[model samples]
Target: SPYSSDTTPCCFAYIARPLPRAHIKEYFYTSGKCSNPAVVFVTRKNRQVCANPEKKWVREYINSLEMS
Candidate 1:
């Protein structure tokens, strides 16, 4: 699994503040039966952070990522 992504289940709690969107490499949604409604962001530094899904910038990231 060299160079493949880490698919770990993340996001125990949302971060206090959001990181610069530019530093975020990718994201995944923590939805469905899980109680934590969050968006997980992976940074270029390879650290994954949990962001509040209700935040405006989080929606910005979602919009930009969807690109349509």
Candidate 2:
């Protein structure tokens, strides 16, 4: 077997306040292995902060990152 797939990253909880956009390097989506659908924001400091996908700021960040 191919071991199901790549190692899945899951978020147990999410941050309330959106991170400063400047500090975020990029973002990636969680896999089906995850129960919570989260946007994992990669930080300049090398931290992965889990964000609620439904949040407004999260949507903006994703849009801008994609635009860039």
Candidate 3:
């Protein structure tokens, strides 16, 4: 739950809405250097955003996914 002054309100706004587990599995993506990874989650409306990996929730969520 780390806060980033750089984070835009609209970025978190999408996260507030729920995404189907299946869709999250299929469309959610992560990438970036190991020291600074990034997360990309596409919404039901086809809207997508790249989130800050420094956030705890981002780290946890990406960790929950497969490595390969």
What is the per-residue lDDT of model 1 for residues 6-39, given as tens digits with 9 covering 90 to 100?
5546477877776677887777777433677778
- Model 2, position 46, has a per-residue lDDT of 44
lDDT (0 to 1) per candidate: 0.69, 0.75, 0.46
lDDT of 2 by residue, 11-52 (tens): 767779886677887877777466898887887874778778
Pairs that collide in candidate 1 are none
Predicted structure with the largest TM-score when compared to the true one: 2
Name the lDDT value of residue 22 in candidate 2. 79
Q: What residue runs in model 1 are displaced by over 4 Å at the alpha carbon?
A: 1-8, 66-68
Whichever of 1 and 2 has more TM-score, that candidate is 2
lDDT of 3 by residue, 1-68 (tens): 55445443233322543344335542344433234344555534546654454555655655665644
* Candidate 1, run of 10 with poorest lDDT: 1-10
Best by lDDT: 2
lDDT of 2 at 63: 70
Ranking by TM-score: 2, 1, 3
RMSD, candidate 3, Å: 9.3
